[PDB]
Design an enzyme around this catalytic site. Structure first.
Site, PDB file in Angstrom:
ATOM      1  N   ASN A   1      -2.599  -2.905   3.452  1.00  0.00           N
ATOM      2  CA  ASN A   1      -1.889  -4.070   2.942  1.00  0.00           C
ATOM      3  C   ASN A   1      -2.153  -5.297   3.806  1.00  0.00           C
ATOM      4  OD1 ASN A   1      -0.045  -6.091   2.215  1.00  0.00           O
ATOM      5  ND2 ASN A   1       1.777  -4.875   2.718  1.00  0.00           N
TER       6      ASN A   1
ATOM      7  N   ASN B   1      -3.575   3.418   6.422  1.00  0.00           N
ATOM      8  CA  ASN B   1      -3.439   3.036   5.030  1.00  0.00           C
ATOM      9  C   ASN B   1      -1.978   2.743   4.710  1.00  0.00           C
ATOM     10  OD1 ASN B   1      -2.087   5.457   3.492  1.00  0.00           O
ATOM     11  ND2 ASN B   1      -3.541   6.386   4.929  1.00  0.00           N
TER      12      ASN B   1
ATOM     13  N   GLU C   1      -7.195 -15.310   2.023  1.00  0.00           N
ATOM     14  CA  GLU C   1      -5.990 -14.666   2.538  1.00  0.00           C
ATOM     15  C   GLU C   1      -6.232 -14.124   3.938  1.00  0.00           C
ATOM     16  OE1 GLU C   1      -3.561 -12.050   0.108  1.00  0.00           O
ATOM     17  OE2 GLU C   1      -2.459 -11.382   1.877  1.00  0.00           O
TER      18      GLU C   1
ATOM     19  N   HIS D   1      -5.908 -12.511  -5.778  1.00  0.00           N
ATOM     20  CA  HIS D   1      -5.758 -13.791  -5.064  1.00  0.00           C
ATOM     21  C   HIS D   1      -7.169 -14.331  -4.829  1.00  0.00           C
ATOM     22  CE1 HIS D   1      -1.536 -12.866  -4.302  1.00  0.00           C
ATOM     23  NE2 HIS D   1      -1.907 -11.694  -3.814  1.00  0.00           N
TER      24      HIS D   1
ATOM     25  N   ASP E   1      -3.889  -7.658  -0.250  1.00  0.00           N
ATOM     26  CA  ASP E   1      -3.257  -6.345  -0.352  1.00  0.00           C
ATOM     27  C   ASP E   1      -3.842  -5.615  -1.564  1.00  0.00           C
ATOM     28  OD1 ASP E   1      -1.551  -4.130  -0.391  1.00  0.00           O
ATOM     29  OD2 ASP E   1       0.182  -5.273  -1.102  1.00  0.00           O
TER      30      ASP E   1
ATOM     31  N   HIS F   1      -4.490  -8.438 -10.631  1.00  0.00           N
ATOM     32  CA  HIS F   1      -5.697  -8.086  -9.897  1.00  0.00           C
ATOM     33  C   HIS F   1      -6.758  -7.586 -10.858  1.00  0.00           C
ATOM     34  CE1 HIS F   1      -5.462  -8.459  -5.550  1.00  0.00           C
ATOM     35  NE2 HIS F   1      -4.164  -8.226  -5.639  1.00  0.00           N
TER      36      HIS F   1
ATOM     37  N   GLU G   1       5.326 -15.029  -7.013  1.00  0.00           N
ATOM     38  CA  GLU G   1       5.549 -13.570  -7.126  1.00  0.00           C
ATOM     39  C   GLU G   1       7.056 -13.284  -7.151  1.00  0.00           C
ATOM     40  OE1 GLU G   1       1.724 -12.914  -4.121  1.00  0.00           O
ATOM     41  OE2 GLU G   1       3.320 -11.397  -4.086  1.00  0.00           O
ATOM     42  N   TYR G   2       7.492 -12.447  -8.088  1.00  0.00           N
ATOM     43  CA  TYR G   2       8.886 -12.000  -8.145  1.00  0.00           C
ATOM     44  C   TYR G   2       8.971 -10.678  -8.912  1.00  0.00           C
ATOM     45  CZ  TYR G   2       9.811 -13.205 -13.089  1.00  0.00           C
ATOM     46  OH  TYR G   2       9.823 -13.239 -14.463  1.00  0.00           O
ATOM     47  N   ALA G   3      10.133 -10.032  -8.851  1.00  0.00           N
ATOM     48  CA  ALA G   3      10.385  -8.772  -9.565  1.00  0.00           C
ATOM     49  C   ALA G   3       9.293  -7.735  -9.288  1.00  0.00           C
ATOM     50  CB  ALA G   3      10.552  -9.023 -11.065  1.00  0.00           C
ATOM     51  N   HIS G   4       9.257  -7.270  -8.043  1.00  0.00           N
ATOM     52  CA  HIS G   4       8.238  -6.337  -7.576  1.00  0.00           C
ATOM     53  C   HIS G   4       8.346  -5.004  -8.333  1.00  0.00           C
ATOM     54  CE1 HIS G   4       5.936  -3.995  -4.462  1.00  0.00           C
ATOM     55  NE2 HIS G   4       5.233  -5.113  -4.470  1.00  0.00           N
TER      56      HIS G   4
ATOM     57  N   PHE H   1       1.761   1.763  -1.799  1.00  0.00           N
ATOM     58  CA  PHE H   1       2.063   0.331  -1.897  1.00  0.00           C
ATOM     59  C   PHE H   1       1.047  -0.499  -2.717  1.00  0.00           C
ATOM     60  CE2 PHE H   1       3.338  -3.876  -0.091  1.00  0.00           C
ATOM     61  CZ  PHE H   1       4.668  -3.817  -0.484  1.00  0.00           C
TER      62      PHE H   1
ATOM     63  N   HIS I   1      -3.619 -12.728   5.967  1.00  0.00           N
ATOM     64  CA  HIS I   1      -2.285 -12.159   6.188  1.00  0.00           C
ATOM     65  C   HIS I   1      -2.132 -11.470   7.549  1.00  0.00           C
ATOM     66  CE1 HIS I   1       1.288 -10.348   3.705  1.00  0.00           C
ATOM     67  NE2 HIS I   1       1.676 -10.761   4.901  1.00  0.00           N
TER      68      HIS I   1
ATOM     69  N   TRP J   1      10.609  -3.666  -0.062  1.00  0.00           N
ATOM     70  CA  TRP J   1      10.517  -3.425   1.372  1.00  0.00           C
ATOM     71  C   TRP J   1      11.819  -3.686   2.126  1.00  0.00           C
ATOM     72  CZ3 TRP J   1       7.249  -6.193  -1.684  1.00  0.00           C
ATOM     73  CH2 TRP J   1       7.357  -7.597  -1.669  1.00  0.00           C
TER      74      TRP J   1
ATOM     75  N   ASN K   1       2.004  -1.325  -7.924  1.00  0.00           N
ATOM     76  CA  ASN K   1       3.146  -2.222  -8.152  1.00  0.00           C
ATOM     77  C   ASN K   1       3.214  -2.738  -9.585  1.00  0.00           C
ATOM     78  OD1 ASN K   1       1.956  -3.885  -5.184  1.00  0.00           O
ATOM     79  ND2 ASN K   1       3.296  -2.071  -5.217  1.00  0.00           N
TER      80      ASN K   1
ATOM     81  N   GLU L   1      -0.930 -16.135   1.424  1.00  0.00           N
ATOM     82  CA  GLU L   1      -0.547 -15.518   2.700  1.00  0.00           C
ATOM     83  C   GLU L   1      -1.513 -15.794   3.848  1.00  0.00           C
ATOM     84  OE1 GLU L   1       0.361 -11.496   1.153  1.00  0.00           O
ATOM     85  OE2 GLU L   1       2.468 -12.127   1.122  1.00  0.00           O
TER      86      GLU L   1
HETATM   87  O1  LIG Z   1       3.631 -10.886  -0.819  1.00  0.00           O
HETATM   88  C1  LIG Z   1       2.918 -10.148  -1.467  1.00  0.00           C
HETATM   89  O2  LIG Z   1       3.569  -9.000  -2.079  1.00  0.00           O
HETATM   90  C2  LIG Z   1       2.793  -8.024  -2.782  1.00  0.00           C
HETATM   91  C3  LIG Z   1       3.339  -6.661  -2.370  1.00  0.00           C
HETATM   92  O3  LIG Z   1       2.834  -5.659  -3.242  1.00  0.00           O
HETATM   93  C4  LIG Z   1       1.293  -8.148  -2.515  1.00  0.00           C
HETATM   94  O4  LIG Z   1       0.983  -7.758  -1.169  1.00  0.00           O
HETATM   95  C5  LIG Z   1       0.859  -9.590  -2.719  1.00  0.00           C
HETATM   96  O5  LIG Z   1      -0.561  -9.644  -2.660  1.00  0.00           O
HETATM   97  C6  LIG Z   1       1.450 -10.445  -1.609  1.00  0.00           C
HETATM   98  O6  LIG Z   1       1.239 -11.835  -1.875  1.00  0.00           O
HETATM   99 MG   LIG Z   2      -0.920 -10.009   1.830  1.00  0.00          MG
HETATM  100 NA    NA Z   3       1.058  -4.061  -2.988  1.00  0.00          NA
END
Ligand SMILES: O=C1O[C@H](CO)[C@H](O)[C@H](O)[C@H]1O
Ligand SMILES: [Mg+2]
Ligand code: NA
Ligand SMILES: [Mg+2]
Ligand code: NA
Ligand code: NA
Ligand code: NA
Ligand code: NA
Lengths: 1015, 210
Positions: A94, A589, A408, A383, A193, A349, A529-532, A593, A410, A991, A596, A453
């Site tokens: 990730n 790894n 990215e 991304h 990720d 993706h 990004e929302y509602a994972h 995760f 991150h 998380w 999603n 990120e």
């Molecule tokens: O913040 C995030 O949350 C997701 C978690 O699955 C994923 O890592 C996305 O690429 C990232 O921008």
């Molecule tokens: Mg990331």
């Molecule tokens: Na992910």
């Protein structure tokens, strides 16, 4: 030279001899071909079988490979990722970089893919003009040779790298040699990720252009105030020898009708003290009453750009689809064609379970159709820039696109370490600038994104301003550094909650409602990004949509995310199974995760998808008396392919139904008067269900497609009539170890040591394999787990709180077990305490009342210690001996639904095969619950009450102990979980604890009651 | 018809258990052929003198959500003090109880009535686990008010100065009570989460001699 300079460990070198970026070209030599977007004879595909050999490092590649085929090479499909062919392992990590963080250096062990192709070139291609090769995607860096001679180098895995082969080719047979490096300095900017793969994973093509050529063109559309007039402005650039006889014609077509045309010689307006661009010209075309482009109605025109001579001889033609639309932010609102958007978006993706990161047309179309069928109107390119075909499909089917640079970082500490460093500005700039140069003519792209990120650095500010300067037609957004920085036109947080603040230092995630009105703040807010949607998730989804609808400046968001990044592996039986992080020996790894998605990798929907579709509906409903008010949330279209079906039912039994044509203006309302409904014969609850049905097929949907629905409770008639008293009386048989109840061939056995119903008989046939016992736990969802691990416990995660409190280990201690005979019944009374290390967690007090009709009425009253973490559920479970084909219930359905994710489900009579009552999440967990159920039927059994249930061949224990769905095995009989109460599933993120207070089981005392009888 | 509804008996049975007598009842409240509420109870009286009352109520989904779900009676006893373990000491309602504290409170009976000039439901205390009055003790998890004025008298009297103490003491013990609201006083102002809309309600009380 190549091995000596190590260009792949130098962020100062992102390419060598690479041609300038530009919009999609085909070099048609016939204007009608360009108009109709027919295949061009000047654009050839090299998507065939290539030769491939794997090496552990570039130093291990023999020089002979430059001149002739390696006999040890294999013949493989291109485009491909070489991990998908088994040459090495794909890695799922990730945040943590898959390589030691030591910029700009990469490991000395650097997997190297040696690709080669022997191919033919027509002599006409070499007698005149320019022959280039185009690699749409090579991951992550590569050197190119043609006929043994070095051509060039390129980085950025997600944009085309183009090289002029004119001087390298001969007529007939040629050989390309491509050395692809897995790791490069480019990898520091590619920390998304997702699976870490490599190779030539997008199209390879050859383009022939004349020497005198269109080298670039930009299309802009500007409008008057009411969009009744437009001006199309087309800037065209040339390369080659300027001649006075050269002309550019730009013509615009609406279908087969040419609506506008303009011709001019080259020579732009004066720009500064030195003059203007002699090699450019700008055409301006007036368009009256343009048909406007939107996701709702993706009206397109065709622009044809002809380079020709004054006497009318065509040199070449390029072309594009044009969508007439204006994107602007005004008074804090994102407007499209002057109307405020509501973004029903998703992150997507580029992922295929078989082919890895190779995208194909059929999968893209499948995705778009499913997205539109489920009420999405927007997509974020998380991304990186996508395969070029993606934008064409979004232009034509109608989806709003956020196009995002492949940046990215991150895993850097802090996140902006590279993005604030001017040494990395050149590498970053190309990832932004070359994206804009490629994609700026696509109407579907409405917003540019600077990446993902990578914190907030000065390089972001520079590149933000570059885009604003070059392309004022589209807002620029970027989430890094707190979602509301100087590098973003849109407040674009990730996983900011609706009502709950998360005041992290430096980069807080405010409640989205609160964020809007912070002192000085005026921008629109759209969550990037929302509602994972990880596993059993989307709890609380409706809370977002209520807020989006109430607050003008909350203009929606992009769900994370579309599709599970699972990959196919094969077991001993050759059976394919779904794999995640660590399954390829990849280490470290991040396990599950990578999964999603709203859909499984093969595009089968998760239950969450129906919740998204329902909440993202384009029609809103209210009921007052007999009147249904239908409100349209469309901005542009009338409801010219919609009818409303209504149905009234009494506890699942249809009473009346009808259909009414919908004729609602965008943003309009229609009142529908329901006819007088006959008063029901029987007691019970009347339910009204309405649905919007599209009678006609579209480009994106079948005839009869349901786009929206809603339910209301109407009249209820409570049952007051007492059932006819039974002429039979059950008998109690008391022994030291048991209380037995007999009634005909039926027997119930209550173990006096355990205090539980241990067996039931219908004749001599046993009904239970495991006693009926209380249950306060669930096999933990991904949302219950978060980031906790055996070697790194996160004490805040729900599962860890439950574990530490002893919920999973708690042992039932019997406090009381009594039996009484009533006038018409036998009454069993029990009390149990659940304790862990001297602490009483739960107390359960029950009565069981068995009457002459063979009905067993169970009352349950539970106490939960206020200081124990709130339990996952309060219910009963048992393993039934029966395995039956069907499950029939009166309750919410037909799909899996949980207390904070049940808005999509409807109350009715549902009947499904048993296997449909199990949701095959790749990482197994509690699954398949249906809520608000009043009657459940299975084999000879009926349960009545007001409960939640799941039913399957898998115990909670097995689901909890099994890490992959393919390893599950159906147990003997059928595991039934009947819950009086069940905790929310959450999902605002996956998380940290995300179950809202109102869905936590915190009341301390709980009551429920069931009746168990024969169907 | 909430104020007009008459209790209609559906069931009344008695059973002798090993160490107890069990009375089971069921009532329907109707108005012009429409069933508004159903109440199902058991009364379990054991050898230790305690009467456990279990109440399960159904509320028709299409009737306006009721103001309370509880029991009332007029006690013969007039006692000086009211003693309770619950929220207090002052009057508190479900949407106005944040100021109240959970503790043991003991007040004169007069303090358990709030003298609003325009009389109404008043003096409730919520989250009460034990109530004591003269020889009586009630235990459970309930809301209550206690005074010399019936809900009927409070409803019929426009000024507090016209109220007269009735014989004995009127006890209202609620499993559940609706919010009082107040965002304004000219339109419905009780928030959804404080309306009694669940359809089915359960509560239990134990009545004994202190
Ligand atoms: O913040 C995030 O949350 C997701 C978690 O699955 C994923 O890592 C996305 O690429 C990232 O921008
Ligand atoms: Mg990331
Ligand atoms: Na992910
Ligand atoms: Mg480099
Ligand atoms: Na809004
Ligand atoms: Na219509
Ligand atoms: Na599991
Ligand atoms: Na009054």
């Amino acid at each position: 030279v190549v091995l000596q300079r190590r260009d792949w460990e130098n962020p100062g070198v992102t390419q060598l001899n690479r041609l300038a970026a530009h919009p999609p070209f085909a070099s048609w030599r016939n204007s009608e071909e360009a108009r109709t977007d027919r295949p061009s004879q000047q654009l050839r595909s090299l998507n065939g079988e290539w030769r491939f050999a794997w090496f552990p490092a570039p130093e291990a590649v023999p020089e002979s490979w430059l001149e002739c085929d390696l006999p040890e090479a294999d013949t493989v499909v291109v485009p491909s990722n070489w991990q998908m062919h088994g040459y090495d392992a794909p890695i799922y990590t990730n945040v943590t970089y898959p390589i030691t963080v030591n910029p700009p250096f990469v490991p000395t062990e650097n997997p190297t893919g040696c690709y080669s192709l022997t191919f033919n070139v027509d002599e006409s291609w070499l007698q005149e003009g320019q022959t280039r090769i185009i690699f749409d995607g090579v991951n992550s860096a590569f050197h190119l040779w043609c006929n043994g001679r070095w051509v060039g180098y390129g980085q950025d895995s997600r944009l085309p790298s183009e090289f002029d082969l004119s001087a390298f080719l001969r007529a007939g047979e040629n050989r390309l040699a491509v050395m692809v490096l897995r790791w490069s300095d480019g990898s520091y900017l590619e920390d998304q990720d997702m699976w870490r793969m490599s190779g030539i994973f997008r199209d390879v093509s050859l383009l022939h252009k004349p020497t005198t050529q269109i080298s670039d063109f930009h299309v802009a559309t500007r409008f008057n105030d009411d969009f009744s007039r437009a001006v199309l402005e087309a800037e065209v650039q040339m390369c080659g020898e300027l001649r006075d006889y050269l002309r550019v014609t730009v013509s615009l077509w609406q279908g087969e009708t040419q609506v506008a045309s303009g011709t001019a010689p080259f020579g732009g307006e004066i720009i500064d003290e030195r003059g203007g661009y002699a090699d450019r010209v700008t055409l301006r075309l007036n368009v009256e009453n343009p048909k406007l482009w939107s996701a709702e109605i993706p009206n397109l025109y065709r622009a044809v750009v002809e380079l020709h001579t004054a006497d009318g001889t065509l040199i070449e033609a390029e072309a594009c689809d044009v969508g007439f639309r204006e994107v602007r932010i005004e008074n804090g609102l994102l407007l499209l064609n002057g109307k405020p958007l509501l973004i029903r978006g998703v992150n997507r993706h580029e992922h295929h379970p078989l082919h890895g990161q190779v995208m194909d047309e059929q999968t893209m179309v499948q995705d778009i159709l499913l997205m539109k069928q489920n009420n999405f109107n927007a997509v974020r390119c998380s991304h990186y820039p996508n395969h070029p075909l993606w934008y064409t499909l979004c232009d034509r089917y109608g989806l709003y696109v956020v196009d995002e640079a492949n940046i990215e970082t991150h895993g850097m500490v802090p996140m902006n370490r590279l993005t604030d460093d001017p040494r990395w500005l050149p590498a970053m700039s190309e990832r932004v600038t070359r994206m804009v140069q490629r994609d700026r003519n696509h109407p579907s792209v409405i917003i540019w994104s600077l990446g993902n990120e990578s914190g907030h650095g000065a390089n972001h500010d520079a590149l933000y301003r570059w885009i604003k300067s070059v392309d004022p037609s589209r807002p620029v957004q970027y989430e890094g550094g707190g979602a509301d920085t100087t590098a973003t036109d849109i407040i674009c947080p990730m996983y900011a909650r609706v009502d709950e603040d998360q005041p992290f230092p430096a980069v807080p995630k405010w409640s989205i409602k609160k964020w809007l009105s912070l002192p000085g703040e005026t921008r629109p807010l759209i969550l990037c990004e929302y509602a994972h949607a990880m596993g059993n998730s989307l709890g609380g989804f409706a809370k977002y949509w209520q807020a989006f609808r109430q607050y003008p400046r909350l203009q929606g968001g992009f769900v994370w995310d579309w599709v599970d990044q699972s990959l196919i592996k094969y077991d001993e039986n050759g059976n394919p199974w779904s794999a995640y992080g660590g399954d390829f020996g990849d280490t470290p790894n991040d396990r599950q995760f990578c999964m999603n998605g709203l859909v499984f990798a093969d595009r089968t929907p998760h239950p969450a998808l129906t919740e998204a579709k329902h909440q993202q509906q384009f029609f809103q409903f209210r009921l007052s008396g007999q009147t249904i008010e239908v409100t349209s949330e469309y901005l542009f279209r009338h409801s010219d392919n919609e009818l409303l079906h209504w149905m009234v039912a009494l506890d699942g039994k249809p009473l009346a139904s009808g259909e009414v044509p919908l004729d609602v203006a965008p943003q309009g309302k229609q009142l529908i008067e329901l006819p007088e409904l006959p008063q029901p014969e029987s007691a019970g609850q009347l339910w009204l269900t309405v649905r919007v049905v599209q009678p006609n097929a579209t480009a994106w949907s079948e005839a009869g497609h349901i786009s929206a629905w809603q339910q209301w409770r109407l009249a209820e008639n409570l049952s007051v009539t007492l059932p006819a008293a039974s002429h039979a009386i059950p008998h109690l048989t008391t022994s030291e170890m048991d209380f037995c109840i007999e009634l005909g061939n039926k027997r119930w056995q209550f173990n006096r040591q355990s205090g539980f119903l241990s067996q039931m008989w219908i004749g001599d046939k046993k009904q239970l394999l495991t006693p009926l016992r209380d249950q306060f736990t669930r096999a933990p969802l991904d949302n219950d787990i978060g980031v906790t691990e055996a070697t790194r416990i996160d004490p805040n995660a729900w599962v860890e709180r439950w574990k530490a409190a002893g919920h999973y280990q708690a042992e039932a201690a019997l406090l009381q077990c009594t039996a009484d005979t009533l006038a018409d019944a036998v009454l069993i009374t029990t009390a149990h305490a659940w304790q862990h290390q001297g602490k009483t967690l739960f107390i359960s007090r029950k009565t069981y009342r068995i009457d002459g009709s063979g009905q067993m009425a169970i009352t349950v009253d539970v106490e939960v210690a206020s200081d124990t973490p709130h339990p996952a559920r309060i219910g009963l479970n048992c393993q039934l001996a029966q395995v039956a084909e069907r499950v029939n219930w009166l309750g919410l359905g037909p799909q899996e639904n949980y207390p904070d994710r049940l808005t999509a489900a409807c109350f009715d009579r549902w009947d499904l095969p048993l296997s449909d009552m199990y949701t095959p999440y790749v990482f197994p967990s509690e699954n398949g619950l249906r809520c608000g159920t009043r009657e459940l039927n299975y084999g000879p059994h009926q349960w009545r009450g007001d409960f939640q249930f799941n039913i399957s061949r898998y115990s909670q224990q097995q689901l909890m102990e099994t890490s992959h769905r393919h390893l599950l095995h159906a147990e003997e009989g059928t595991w039934l979980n009947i819950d009086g109460f069940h905790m929310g599933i959450g999902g605002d993120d996956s998380w940290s604890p995300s179950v809202s207070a109102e869905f936590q089981l915190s009341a301390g005392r709980y009551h429920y009651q069931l009746v168990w009888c024969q169907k």
